[PDB]
């Protein structure tokens, strides 16, 4: 369940933050958004990493319990160690009932084995992007955009404008006059 526990962070800087990761096993974090001042918090490393193997971790709303108070936020950005890969810093964006928010939503490709371009002409699938940028009110934020490739002939290109979004969801990039390809079917490599 999408729950996080955080404690208020008072000591800042490089020396204090390097101590949190080394000694206490914690992670610094930020809570900005809404109409409120940013608040600095810290949370356990083994708990933030436990939430991050859910598929809809960044596409679902979280109830972050800070000390004894509670509030509704969404994972906005995430910093990772370039070599080891563990999370080093995370910032949350507050959620307001009447306010549009942007998010990164993964793509589920379905019935690939049913694709026409594969059985008949012996093609190959190549997903080009596995996520999109959306913009919707928090009441109708989707967990995943489902892309269907059953009826795709060999050599066909699937763009953003070819898929279907739920009620009240915008594709951002499409709105800006740039519909970049999602997937394709191509002949075998050799």
């Amino acid at each position: 369940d999408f729950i996080l526990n955080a404690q208020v962070r008072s000591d800042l800087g490089k020396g204090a933050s390097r101590r949190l990761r080394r000694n206490a096993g914690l992670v610094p974090a930020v809570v900005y958004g809404g109409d409120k001042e940013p608040q600095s918090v810290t949370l356990e490393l083994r708990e933030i990493a436990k939430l991050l193997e859910n598929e809809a971790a960044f596409s679902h709303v979280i109830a972050l319990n800070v000390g004894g108070a509670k509030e509704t936020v969404l994972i906005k950005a995430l910093q990772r160690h370039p070599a080891k890969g563990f999370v080093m810093h995370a910032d949350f964006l507050r959620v307001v009932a009447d306010h549009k928010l942007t998010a990164h939503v993964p793509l589920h490709f379905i019935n690939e084995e049913v694709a026409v371009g594969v059985k008949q002409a012996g093609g190959e699938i190549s997903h080009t992007i596995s996520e999109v940028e959306v913009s919707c009110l928090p009441k109708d934020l989707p967990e995943f955009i489902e892309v269907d490739m059953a009826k795709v002939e060999l050599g066909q290109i699937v763009h953003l404008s070819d898929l279907k979004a739920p009620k009240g969801v915008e594709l951002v990039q499409l709105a800006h006059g740039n519909d970049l390809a999602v997937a394709n079917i191509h002949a075998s490599r050799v």
Binding site: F58, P82, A83, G85, H104, E124, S126, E131, R189
Partner: protein, 137 residues
Amino acid sequence: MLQPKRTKFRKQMTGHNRGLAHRGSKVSFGEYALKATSRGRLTARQIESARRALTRHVKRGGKIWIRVFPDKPVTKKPLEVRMGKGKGGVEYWVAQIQPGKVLYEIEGVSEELAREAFALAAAKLPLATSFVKRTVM
């Protein structure tokens, strides 16, 4: 053997190789990647030799990306030659590698088949390597 088609200058200083790779450390194109954990530099004969070993194992579908380009010329002074009298001629091209840099990527194959393919490539490279998948962020 990769090398630039043409360069502005023929030679370069040795320089230094410091820091980590905060740029070029994500799986951008494929779904599984080979990441670098130690620093060093790949000599464009290792990059080719590790690509041959990787595509030969799969040899059924799939797509493969190379994310490292060797674009730093290095020289050697011939044998039985004193010190000085100019700078030596260019011998080969290398790519500077920092910890965390992603080297190869692949998709269109099984998750397990990627592991045997990257283990065959990792044995031809003079640095420690890691296997990573792609995350949303």
